[PDB]
Amino acid sequence: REHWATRLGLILAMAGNAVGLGNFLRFPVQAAENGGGAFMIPYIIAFLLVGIPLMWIEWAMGRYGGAQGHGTTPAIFYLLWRNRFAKILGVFGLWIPLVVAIYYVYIESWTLGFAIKFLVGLVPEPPPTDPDSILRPFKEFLYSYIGVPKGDEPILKPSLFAYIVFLITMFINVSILIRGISKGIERFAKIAMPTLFILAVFLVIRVFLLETPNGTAADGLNFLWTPDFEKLKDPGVWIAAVGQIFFTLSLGFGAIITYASYVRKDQDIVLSGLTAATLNEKAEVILGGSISIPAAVAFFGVANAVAIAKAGAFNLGFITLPAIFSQTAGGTFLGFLWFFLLFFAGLTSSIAIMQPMIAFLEDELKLSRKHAVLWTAAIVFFSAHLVMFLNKSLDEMDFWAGTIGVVFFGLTELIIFFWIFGADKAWEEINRGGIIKVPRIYYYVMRYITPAFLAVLLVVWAREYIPKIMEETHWTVWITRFYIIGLFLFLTFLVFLAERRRNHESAGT
């Protein structure tokens, strides 16, 4: 089995897995919608009670499974729990990352397309003037790129440029993945992560210099880091915070598991795990948080910024920020650096999200790396046409796989590892080979606190928030639901084909 060549390469690859569009696009929107500093206390508590323990748990499960030649959850779940139901539940660790891949790579392709056009100066020219005279050209720029519906049909019409750039993005992901773990992912991570950090720091510095009659970058920081204790009682803030923690640390996607399955059987995961997670948190709260919000607040004031963030998920990063930059000397190039940053943030993450599918085809169906990568790319590419051409399909996939799915899977994987497989056996598996040991308190966190936290969360979620979406949606959501249910059935069938293959091999020996 392939292994990570160096410890640094391991850490940077795992940091690249976690550090992504979630740090720079999702986090600021989530924090801004939920009162800035009011979002941060639940967020921090979620990092400690959920983020950290699940990270160690997923590293352990992957390392454990990798030692036996298995990097994905259909097989790994079965190793921890010898029941046919474990294989079925394991299918989610293939389904979640595949479905997320289908929209994540497409959004990643936009950052590349924007980087290209911003570099060559093929951007909108605002009148040299109210905010809307500045923002509108950039709104139309995004709208023409992804092809937002101009009528009442729920159909998107991406530009030819956007489509070709998606193909190129897919090509770039394949070029890295096809070279494997050490010579592809690990090697790229060593080049990508320092670069990414450099760009982000520069952007933070450049944004900290923003100043207008409406305020400064410092105002944006104070809004993000000023605690509001009268919001700790709102369930909505906790749900948003835990969902961000999952999304940001790549947890519940079966993808930390798969990466960890290339860690050598006795190699450390306690310090490595903690370090990869802390690296992500710094890139998130210090870098991601210091760019978008402070810039928006400096130009529009706190109240307007919050309204912008609420407007959409992509408004702040694809419209507002580049519009703001356009009013600053060298702002088009700064727009380029921002989109180039997002692209490397996306790319280092999308190779991670597609690897579980690759690992499954290699490990369980005995495909070569070449074939596993190409077939995986083929499924993601073909499937992405749904997200490219059907308005709101992206939203539906992100809800079922990237939002609900990950929390459910987080709880599932913990129960299987710490309850079914055995708490003391799990505790010993995590700690084996550790450069440091997991603090004793975290045994009781993992066994009792974390599962109860997630279970209560999911209950409050399904009671007071999901019935508002099962009745209040356009019929076209069923196209996406139909298709991704079909993907789950497809993956179940492959797991079935893999158990049959394993049986025929065992018979002929």
Ligand X SMILES: N[C@@H](Cc1ccc(F)cc1)C(=O)O
For residue 390, the 8-state DSSP code is B
**How many C-beta neighbours within 10 Å does residue 503 have?**
10
478 makes contact with a copy of itself (CB under 8 A): yes
Nearest CB to Na ion, comparing residues 9 and 65: 9
266 in contact with ligand BOG (CB under 6 A): no
| Residue 468 touches ligand BOG, criterion: CB under 6 A | no
Q: Determine contact, residues 396/480, Cβ cutoff 8 Å.
A: yes
Q: Residue 160 and residue 157: Cα distance in Å, rounded?
A: 9
| Count of alpha carbons within 13 angstroms of residue 90, beta-carbon side | 33
Query: What is the sign, positive or negative, of the torsion defined by CA atoms of 375, 376, 379, 382?
Result: negative
- Interacting positions 119-148 with a copy of itself (CB under 8 A): none
Q: Is 248 in the site for Na ion (CB under 5 A)?
A: yes
Which one among 348, 376, 391, 412 touches Na ion, defined by CB under 5 A? 348
- Residue 221 interacting with a copy of itself (CB under 8 A): no
| Binding to a copy of itself in span 149-178, by CB under 8 A | 153, 155
Cα–Cα distances (Å) from 320 to 134, 139, 299, 326, in that order, read 9, 8, 10, 10
Pick 3 or 392: Cβ nearer ligand BOG: 392
> Is 206 marked within a binding site?
no
Cβ-based neighbours of 254, under 8 Å, separated by 6 or more = 72, 73, 92, 93, 94, 96, 97, 356, 409
Q: Summarize as ranges the residues that interact with ligand X (CB under 6 A).
A: 17-18, 20-23, 97, 247-248, 250, 253, 255, 349, 352-353
Q: How far apart are CA 361 and CA 308, in angstroms?
A: 43
439 touches, from a copy of itself, Na ion, ligand BOG, none (C-beta below 5 to 8 Å by class): ligand BOG
Q: Is 382 in the site for a copy of itself (CB under 8 A)?
A: yes
355 contacts Na ion (rule: CB under 5 A): no
Residue 55 or 386: the one with the smaller Cβ distance to ligand X is: 55
Alpha helices (runs of H) in 364-449, residue ranges in sequence order: 369-389, 393-399, 406-414, 423-431, 441-444
Shortest CA distance to 200 belongs to which of 145, 259, 279, 95?
279
Distance CA 414, CA 151 (A): 47
For the bound state, the minimum distance from the C-beta of residue 21 to ligand BOG, rounded and expressed in Å, comes to 21
Binding residues for phosphocholine: 84
List contacts with Na ion (CB under 5 A). Answer: 16, 18-20, 22-23, 248, 280, 345, 348-349
Which residues contact ligand BOG by CB under 6 A? Answer: 48-49, 116, 155, 157-158, 160-161, 163-164, 385-386, 389-390, 439-441, 445, 470-473, 475, 477-479, 481-482, 485
| Residues forming the site for a copy of itself (CB under 8 A) | 153, 155, 365-367, 371, 375, 378-379, 382-383, 385-386, 389, 475, 478-479, 482-483, 485-486, 489-490, 493, 496-497, 500-501, 504, 508
- Residues contributing to the annotated binding site: 84
